[PDB]
Structure formats: structure tokens, C-alpha cells
Design a binder for these strands. Structure first.
Ligand SMILES: [Zn+2]
Length: 61
DNA sequence: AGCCTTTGACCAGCG
DNA sequence: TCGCTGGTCAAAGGC
């Protein structure tokens, strides 16, 4: 729910590390842009980490 | 209508 | 080999 200035579309969600956390997978909405992030929530909905892969081919919108 | 989640299937690296 | 764990796909539904 927090923002970092980019547009992400969610392409999956999975339970990990023995149903302890749940991980959400997003990729950047800008065309041809291969950047993906994932973010990983605690059982209480609190966000633990955020993982960024790659870089955008466009600047911040 | 055109974006967006959600959800289970699919699949691939690895133990 | 085999089954587990995680990453993605595609089909549906919501706003
Ligand atoms: Zn991008």
C-alpha cells in the first residue's frame, strides 16, 4: 500500500517460509520495462521487506 | 472498456 | 528420481 513513485501490476501472490509470510509479486507497468519488485507481508499484514529487481527503462512518472 | 487482483495451475531450480 | 518450495501464467472477476 506504500508508494515509491512507479506503477506496478500484481502478477502473483504466494505463501512462503512455511505459511509464515506471504509474498506479493509486481512488475512495472511501463512498456518494455523489465523491472520487477516483490514485497513480503507478515501474518499481521505488516510489511517486512521489499525486493527490487532490475532497473526501469523510463524515468519516474 | 481498460486497466487492475485474485487464485489455482503450471513449471523450474535444488535438496 | 521425487517431491518441495518458490516464481510466473492465464482465466476469471472487480471497479
Ligand atoms: Zn519500469
Amino acid at each position: 500500500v506504500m508508494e515509491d513513485g512507479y506503477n506496478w501490476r500484481k502478477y502473483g501472490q504466494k505463501l512462503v517460509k512455511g505459511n509464515e509470510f506471504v509474498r506479493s509479486y509486481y512488475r512495472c507497468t511501463h512498456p518494455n520495462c523489465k523491472a520487477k519488485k516483490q514485497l513480503e507481508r507478515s501474518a499481521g499484514g505488516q510489511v517486512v521487506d521489499t525486493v527490487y529487481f532490475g532497473e526501469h527503462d523510463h524515468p519516474k512518472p
